[PDB]
Amino acid sequence: DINIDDILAELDKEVSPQQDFSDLMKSWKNERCSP
Amino acid sequence: KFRYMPFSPAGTPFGFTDRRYLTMNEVGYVSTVKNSEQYSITVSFFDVGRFREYHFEDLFGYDLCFLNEKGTLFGQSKTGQIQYRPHDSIHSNWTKIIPLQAGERITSVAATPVRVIVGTSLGYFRSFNQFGVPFAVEKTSPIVALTAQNYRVFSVHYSQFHGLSYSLSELGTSSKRYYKRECPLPMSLPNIKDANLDYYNFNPMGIKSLFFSSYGDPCIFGSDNTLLLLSKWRSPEESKWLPILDSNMEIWKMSGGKETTDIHVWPLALAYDTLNCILVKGKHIWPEFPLPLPSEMEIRMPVFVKSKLLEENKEIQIPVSMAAEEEYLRSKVLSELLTDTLENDGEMYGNENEVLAALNGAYDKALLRLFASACSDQNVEKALSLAHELKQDRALTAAVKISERAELPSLVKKINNIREARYE
Amino acid sequence: KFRYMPFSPAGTPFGFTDRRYLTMNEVGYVSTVKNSEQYSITVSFFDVGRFREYHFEDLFGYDLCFLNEKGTLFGQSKTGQIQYRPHDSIHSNWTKIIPLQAGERITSVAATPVRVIVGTSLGYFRSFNQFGVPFAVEKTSPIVALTAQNYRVFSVHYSQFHGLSYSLSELGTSSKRYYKRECPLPMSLPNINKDANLDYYNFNPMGIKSLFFSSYGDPCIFGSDNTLLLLSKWRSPEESKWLPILDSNMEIWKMSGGKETTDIHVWPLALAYDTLNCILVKGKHIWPEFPLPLPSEMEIRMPVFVKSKLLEENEIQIPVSMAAEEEYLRSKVLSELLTDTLENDGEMYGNENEVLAALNGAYDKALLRLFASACSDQNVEKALSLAHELKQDRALTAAVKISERAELPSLVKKINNIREARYEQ
Amino acid sequence: FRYMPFSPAGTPFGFTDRRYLTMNEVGYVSTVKNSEQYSITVSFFDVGRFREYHFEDLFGYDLCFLNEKGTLFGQSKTGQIQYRPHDSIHSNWTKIIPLQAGERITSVAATPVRVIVGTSLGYFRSFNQFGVPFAVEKTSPIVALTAQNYRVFSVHYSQFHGLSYSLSELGTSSKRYYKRECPLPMSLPNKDANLDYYNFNPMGIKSLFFSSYGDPCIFGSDNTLLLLSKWRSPEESKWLPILDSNMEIWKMSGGKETTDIHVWPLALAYDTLNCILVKGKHIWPEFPLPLPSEMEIRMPVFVKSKLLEENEIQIPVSMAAEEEYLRSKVLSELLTDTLENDGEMYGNENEVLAALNGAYDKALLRLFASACSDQNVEKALSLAHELKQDRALTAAVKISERAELPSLVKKINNIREARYEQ
């Protein structure tokens, strides 16, 4: 069939404390294990 | 030959054991233990913040029960004893014997914030206010099953001389109203294996449960393991039963086919679009005392042609045509139920209009995915008939874009006429 | 496999006695004696002061009958001959043949001052004016019993493919209305699975003893369960509901002293407001004998009583609280029925406002006895709910006085809140 | 219960490779065994508007329906359906429907707008005319279906529900059910020539259709045509047994109680049933299909014993006047109901109604003359109350003068005054 997933995407499209905590977790995990 | 038996929603038999459930629903569950010559009853709740579990020794051997927010109602089918127990215990308990002729039984009981209701195998329908004052006695076709939610009462009637039928009421503190009285019910009865025969000796109607949605729509789940919901019940000339979930089909699907058996669905409540149920496993159809967690099944409109799925799958993957058909139909019926709720009853939480908007988005998306297949076969008329169905003009632009990419200028032209008509 | 035997209200078998009744009614009764294999009709009346008896030979074998104020209607179930005989003779008698298809019977017939109706075992509903001109033909579920009053017709249907059901209809000037339309009927059938019972239910397998309108035009029926059902609020179909307003078997059990008598039976005639007019049959055969007992009466009584309490707490003497319950319910239902009659039909006898006021007095008095019972247990919530059910200020202040002597001030405050909220209107 | 497939006026095989699937106003459909393949023929009675064609069927379609815009086919056991427009510029389409274990399709129906399928488990599935599924609903088990424009008329039966019907219409805003699973007053059937048919169609519903003016009808095992009058107001609706074909066959057979001629219903068109008269051992039409024929609608007030006492059979004039009065009354009601709600269908109806009310009064006047010849004042006066036109009231007055009955003159003059003084 004719694919339309991009058409549906352009229709469907119409900082955070949680990301900061996740970045802290990433920083802690990277720091602990790196030389 | 047929026999009348006491019913309560989602209650279970004893079987080989010495304990069973009297009822279970969105509020909680009730269990009874054959403690030698007397019965230990435990009333347990799912919201343990609002309600505290309690238990008592029962010397009468109650076999009927109904549990709601304001209190528990009990009944002994053979002797006519009933008892009501408010949950706060600020209002008193009370007990009564209702009169039974020889061989008559209470077949079901129910309760309401200003009423208590008892129905019998000879069709007497006795009403008491919530403090036990007798208020009325009707006679109807025998009430084989019965429930309420808030003030809305929904009952199923049966006899060899009237057939299977239902009634729907809204009793209230004022403006006491009846929506439908003893209309025929399209549910399927069992064949009036031995474990099934044991259950149907306990419950000959095969009504595993009977309840209301969270938004107050009547629901019933019969021996065919198919959930039925009465849609547009508030306007009786338009009402219709929707088979919103064939649980045998969805069990066969989620198990990956294989004619999967010895797994059964035991329903508790629909919530909004998602049947809470215990999934029982093994030969017996009903749960054991350590009540498992009530697993969730989303409703599925029964459009799934099993042979087509067997051919494509020989874990099951669904063709997008079938998936979009089910998506379009499910989103339409759910949007209609939400619209009728919000018009007549209004929002109970603070997000139902937002849910309805999101659901309309899913509806138009399903229509576009079917429109694409119609355009792939270059069927201009089928595609145009689908184009009329879209609710959002903003989404109807996608029908234009698809018909352009399908090189169908006739579809583009006609859809542009609809764009202009919708703007105007 | 069922047999569509002919039916008429309160009619009886022959049994092994060649004298039989075709119908009985508040007007009178009809009987036949099978002399020389023809049928000497006898038509009799209970208010002899304005109707003459008369006697004649039916040579056709009329086995169906209806008796009304204005005349009597007959029918021969097999051949379809029917006959109308007015009770004066300013109007003529007349006779007609009705079409029967193969294997069909006329099942029942009825008449009023402005209509005549016939029903058959293949469900044909045929109707005529009082002079015998056909006015309509219609097909329905197989009509197995039938009755009528004024413009109103109440019919009962049964088959293996429709179930027991009923219809209620009324002729307007322009067109007929159906209030109820082959709706299921909550009456019990006889136990098809005792020799007198088997005789009667061979004569009448459907087990209806009689079905009739009240003195105020409410449909009623009396079946094998021996309880009088009345269809309340029939004037508003969505909310109409059958009331079992009398268990005559329970009342016979009471009057015989709490005794399981096999030897007294009630045969209905008509619901005159508070009372069922009836014949109290006695002995083995459960239908009236040739010398009729006089038209008796039972008061209607709601079936709230239970034997297990009547036996131990008590020719049986009712406890005061259980009596107050039944009085409350009976007053409630009759008050509603007369209110609806007054709103819909108006005064039919010119005194119903006073009867309704008397019922409301009995209603509030029954509630006051229940209120005293609740306050005797100091059940505040039950008593206050009962106080909401009272419907006149005199009774509300009496409830306050009963609360005061119950030393219960919470009720005193709350019922005075009711009083304030009501007299401020 | 058995739940065999149904289609309007279809027939069994009966140890014969040919059978009919449907018969209508527009035409008929038939199929032939072709080894394990089937041949199918679609044939038309209006060969001017439509064209006959064949096709070969590998699925074994046994349900069918024949709308003027297209034919619908269905396979009862396997659950496939197919739609074939007559304006073949519109594409055909095919859909496989979900059938559960032991389920069968029991009926199908089609319209210019909507396609309907019903099953032995009471699922009631709807599609638009291009095969887009528009709704799923559950009912008690469907045993028969028919449709016309937006309107749908279904029959249901179950051991746990009895025999019943629904009448529905798809409004643009919403669907409406005028009557919903209400009990249906048709007789089910009560030997081999009967058994061969009732093993194919155990309900004995020979056909199921709407009138030319859009009122539902059914034709059952009793061979009586039932029409649902005043269906547009359920508070007052009536099933009228407007024609007993056994009486007409007996009348036209000179009073012979023949089992050698039967009628097959095709469709009602005002005062005439289109039908096929069929003769011989089998009660259903055979391979060389006879021409369509007509019976006038004639209401069942005839008494057989009285007619053979009177006597081709000739009706005594009073009985004839009764039948004509009764039929003119009910048909006048149908025309008024249709013209008030649906409006003119073809533009002839408004004059037909006036002529029909003339016939109504003309029949009542023969009854009035009969009463006045018996000198029965009260019967005659009630008959005078039923008259419509002032010409008819004055004719009744002149009859009563001719009957030397002046009490009727005074009374009917006062009725005439009561009408014209307004």
Side-chain angles (χ1 to χ4, degrees), chain B residues 41-322:
Chain B
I41 285 175
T42 308
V43 178
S44 299
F45 297 88
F46 285 122
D47 191 319
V48 303
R50 289 178 70 196
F51 311 111
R52 296 202 301 204
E53 159 170 314
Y54 68 92
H55 71 87
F56 60 99
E57 292 297 302
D58 172 23
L59 306 177
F60 317 104
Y62 297 137
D63 52 3
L64 297 130
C65 185
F66 176 81
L67 179 68
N68 69 355
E69 306 203 335
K70 301 300 185 185
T72 316
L73 178 64
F74 292 92
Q76 158 54 275
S77 66
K78 282 176 177 282
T79 77
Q81 177 90 323
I82 64 151
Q83 176 176 9
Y84 182 63
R85 302 190 71 128
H87 287 154
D88 56 23
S89 199
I90 301 292
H91 302 165
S92 183
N93 303 342
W94 60 257
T95 308
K96 187 174 292 304
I97 298 181
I98 70 101
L100 300 177
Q101 299 193 349
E104 187 181 359
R105 303 176 78 173
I106 300 175
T107 45
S108 61
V109 303
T112 285
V114 300
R115 260 200 185 186
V116 163
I117 300 175
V118 181
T120 76
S121 65
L122 293 182
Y124 295 89
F125 180 86
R126 307 185 183 267
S127 291
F128 311 89
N129 77 345
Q130 72 281 34
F131 311 117
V133 181
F135 267 27
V137 180
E138 298 173 48
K139 211 178 189 296
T140 63
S141 295
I143 304 88
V144 291
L146 177 65
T147 54
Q149 184 195 82
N150 295 334
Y151 301 105
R152 287 156 187 179
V153 178
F154 163 53
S155 60
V156 173
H157 311 255
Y158 182 80
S159 75
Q160 292 288 70
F161 312 108
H162 304 123
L164 192 64
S165 46
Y166 74 101
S167 297
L168 178 61
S169 313
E170 182 170 37
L171 308 185
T173 184
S174 63
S175 77
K176 198 192 308 300
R177 179 170 169 99
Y178 301 87
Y179 287 85
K180 299 183 71 58
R181 290 285 303 210
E182 281 162 310
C183 287
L185 184 71
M187 203 199 74
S188 299
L189 300 191
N191 308 85
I192 295 166
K193 198 185 294 185
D194 298 351
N196 301 277
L197 276 298
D198 190 3
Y199 177 68
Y200 294 131
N201 271 270
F202 162 83
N203 175 240
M205 303 307 305
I207 298 165
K208 289 179 177 177
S209 198
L210 184 167
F211 50 84
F212 286 75
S213 71
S214 62
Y215 296 125
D217 311 298
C219 299
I220 185 167
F221 190 105
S223 69
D224 59 7
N225 306 336
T226 307
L227 183 62
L228 312 178
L229 180 146
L230 182 58
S231 177
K232 303 199 75 64
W233 58 269
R234 295 178 188 80
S235 53
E237 73 287 354
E238 306 197 342
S239 312
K240 57 189 176 183
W241 285 96
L242 304 181
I244 58 178
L245 174 55
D246 179 1
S247 72
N248 281 3
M249 171 51 70
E250 191 59 22
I251 282 290
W252 171 96
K253 194 194 292 164
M254 71 185 271
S255 62
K258 297 177 70 181
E259 301 185 352
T260 298
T261 300
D262 293 0
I263 170 162
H264 322 275
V265 176
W266 198 260
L268 269 58
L270 178 55
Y272 145 63
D273 65 342
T274 295
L275 180 66
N276 288 100
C277 54
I278 288 77
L279 267 54
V280 184
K281 298 182 183 184
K283 65 190 291 177
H284 297 113
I285 304 97
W286 58 89
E288 290 295 324
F289 168 63
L291 189 63
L293 293 184
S295 186
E296 279 180 340
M297 293 184 75
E298 195 207 331
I299 63 180
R300 295 265 78 88
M301 300 300 287
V303 297
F304 298 97
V305 184
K306 195 168 68 180
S307 178
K308 178 172 280 290
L309 300 178
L310 281 162
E311 277 182 328
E312 298 303 312
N313 294 270
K314 301 189 176 64
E315 291 185 64
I316 284 168
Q317 179 186 352
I318 304 298
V320 289
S321 298
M322 305 173 75

Side-chain angles (χ1 to χ4, degrees), chain C residues 129-300:
Chain C
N129 63 4
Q130 62 273 18
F131 316 120
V133 181
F135 264 40
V137 178
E138 172 177 352
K139 202 176 194 301
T140 65
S141 304
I143 291 162
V144 71
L146 184 60
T147 196
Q149 178 188 100
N150 190 36
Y151 292 110
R152 292 160 194 172
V153 179
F154 165 55
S155 58
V156 173
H157 319 254
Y158 173 77
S159 73
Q160 280 164 1
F161 317 115
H162 304 124
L164 184 71
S165 51
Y166 77 99
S167 302
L168 182 68
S169 64
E170 183 177 41
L171 292 189
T173 52
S174 186
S175 61
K176 183 171 69 179
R177 169 152 71 175
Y178 275 100
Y179 292 97
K180 302 291 280 164
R181 184 49 145 151
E182 295 158 312
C183 295
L185 184 67
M187 190 202 79
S188 185
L189 258 66
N191 183 6
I192 292 171
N193 299 273
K194 193 172 177 184
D195 57 352
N197 305 70
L198 291 159
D199 188 1
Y200 182 75
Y201 299 140
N202 186 46
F203 152 83
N204 176 15
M206 191 50 47
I208 303 162
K209 301 196 196 293
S210 190
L211 75 178
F212 44 86
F213 283 74
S214 73
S215 55
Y216 295 109
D218 309 301
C220 302
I221 185 164
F222 197 109
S224 292
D225 54 58
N226 302 326
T227 71
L228 178 63
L229 312 182
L230 172 147
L231 184 63
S232 65
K233 300 202 80 70
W234 62 262
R235 294 152 174 104
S236 182
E238 65 184 30
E239 58 187 331
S240 62
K241 62 198 198 292
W242 285 100
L243 303 179
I245 52 169
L246 168 58
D247 185 350
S248 69
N249 207 350
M250 172 54 66
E251 288 295 306
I252 287 300
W253 184 93
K254 286 182 188 167
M255 295 303 95
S256 59
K259 181 163 59 177
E260 297 294 338
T261 182
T262 50
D263 304 337
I264 312 172
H265 308 269
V266 187
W267 208 255
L269 293 168
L271 178 62
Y273 172 47
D274 183 52
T275 41
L276 170 62
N277 302 97
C278 52
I279 293 155
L280 275 70
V281 181
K282 305 187 186 181
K284 184 181 174 72
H285 282 173
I286 67 181
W287 56 91
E289 206 187 325
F290 173 47
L292 279 186
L294 283 169
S296 305
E297 292 194 333
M298 285 194 165
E299 292 177 345
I300 70 191

Side-chain angles (χ1 to χ4, degrees), chain A:
Chain A
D1 286 2
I2 300 296
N3 189 279
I4 67 153
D5 302 327
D6 52 349
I7 306 173
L8 297 177
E10 67 162 49
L11 167 59
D12 176 65
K13 64 178 192 178
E14 301 282 24
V15 169
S16 68
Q18 301 83 20
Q19 187 62 58
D20 287 351
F21 179 70
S22 187
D23 288 1
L24 178 64
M25 287 292 298
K26 176 174 71 71
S27 304
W28 173 54
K29 289 166 66 177
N30 287 342
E31 188 74 85
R32 173 62 70 82
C33 188
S34 49

